[PDB]
């Protein structure tokens, strides 16, 4: 089924190089700017979001009043929330570059992560817009044998669970 | 959607010519080599992997760190555990050839293998990397009308349910 999904746009903690994942924190100045150039760029179709404070903004900004999901929340980084990627444990650093065998403590394994996401997208009857996270994007864009880097505010449009359709950044 | 059956690295038993159901016998020198040249062609899927000494060791080697589940196992031999193919009784070795029907005493039948298989397979909710054993990928390939025979340390990557999509002999 078509799918887009949408990656929030960016926060503090981007540019800081935090890792974010449950911390409810806010769109910046120009995570707000890259929402409303969304706007427009995405298909009219039934939206849902995480419930996080970034994604549903996102949403409202792109011009789209969404139904909310906790299951389209970013991984949670348990005792890892906040944690800068540079002084990151080596351990953990290639856990999330491999995208594999992750399990901070007090906090959610890449594995149960996988498992939400994919529950999520199989129960969808029909092409809808998804407003999530870079974690969220990525698990589905590395399940179709694709890199799942794309940039705060951007969104990529999937056949799941076959392919990847399209890569939509703007600027 | 894509899944990836691969078949763990040699053990003594395959070079000796034994059935290797659920005796949990390790990889040998060679079985671990074969795992290590799957890590440079294998894709970045979602692993999983039979909870088997030989099926963990081949997904860790080939750079995985698979979910584990034993619907992914061989099927149980029973007592036909490490019994040699070559002097299998002949009503053991054509119920094995004519896929029609087997159940080994102490062991499994094939109904419940294929039910344990394909129940996993069909639960599957993403593309993935399946780390498994002979059986499971002769089942798949069958089913998908193809011919059940890959070496140990290959794989095959198929288009489940449909057909398959590429054959990695190494
Ligand atoms: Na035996």
């Not at 999904?5 to 806010?26: A, F, I, K």
């Amino acid at each position: 089924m078509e799918l887009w999904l949408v990656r929030h746009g960016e926060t503090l903690w981007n540019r800081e190089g935090r890792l974010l994942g449950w911390t409810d924190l806010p769109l910046t100045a120009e995570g707000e700017a890259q929402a409303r150039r969304l706007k427009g760029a995405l298909p009219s179709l039934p939206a849902f979001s995480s419930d996080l404070m970034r994604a549903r903004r996102t949403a409202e900004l792109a011009g789209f009043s969404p139904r909310l999901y906790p299951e389209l929340r970013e991984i949670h980084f348990g005792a890892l929330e906040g944690a800068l990627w540079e002084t990151l444990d080596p351990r953990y650093k290639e856990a999330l570059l491999r995208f594999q065998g992750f399990h901070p403590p007090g906090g959610e394994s890449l594995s149960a992560f996988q498992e939400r996401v994919f529950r999520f997208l199989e129960g969808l009857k029909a092409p809808a817009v998804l407003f999530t996270h870079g974690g969220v994007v990525r698990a589905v864009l590395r399940a179709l044998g694709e890199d799942g880097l794309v940039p705060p505010g951007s969104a990529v449009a999937v056949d799941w669970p076959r392919r990847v359709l399209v890569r939509l950044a703007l600027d």
